[PDB]
């Protein structure tokens, strides 16, 4: 997995 840590749907 990945998560948004710094985008439009962060
Ligand atoms: Cu980012």
Per residue, the 3-state secondary structure of 1-10, as one string, reads CCCCCCCCCC
Q: 4 with 10: CB under 8 angstroms? A: yes
Resolution (A): 1.6
Spatial neighbors of 4 by CB under 8 A, at least 6 apart, are 10
Residue 1 CA to ligand 1 centre (angstroms) = 15
Residue 2 has, within 13 A of its CA and on its CB side, a CA count of 4
Residue 9 CA to ligand 1 centre (angstroms) = 9
- Distance CA(1)–CA(6), nearest Å, equals 16
Q: 2 with 10: CB under 8 angstroms? A: no
Residue 2 CA to ligand 1 centre (angstroms) = 11
Structure solved via: X-ray
Residue 5 CA to ligand 1 centre (angstroms) = 6
- Distance CA(9)–CA(3), nearest Å, equals 11
């Amino acid at each position: 997995x990945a998560s948004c840590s710094x985008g439009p749907n962060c």
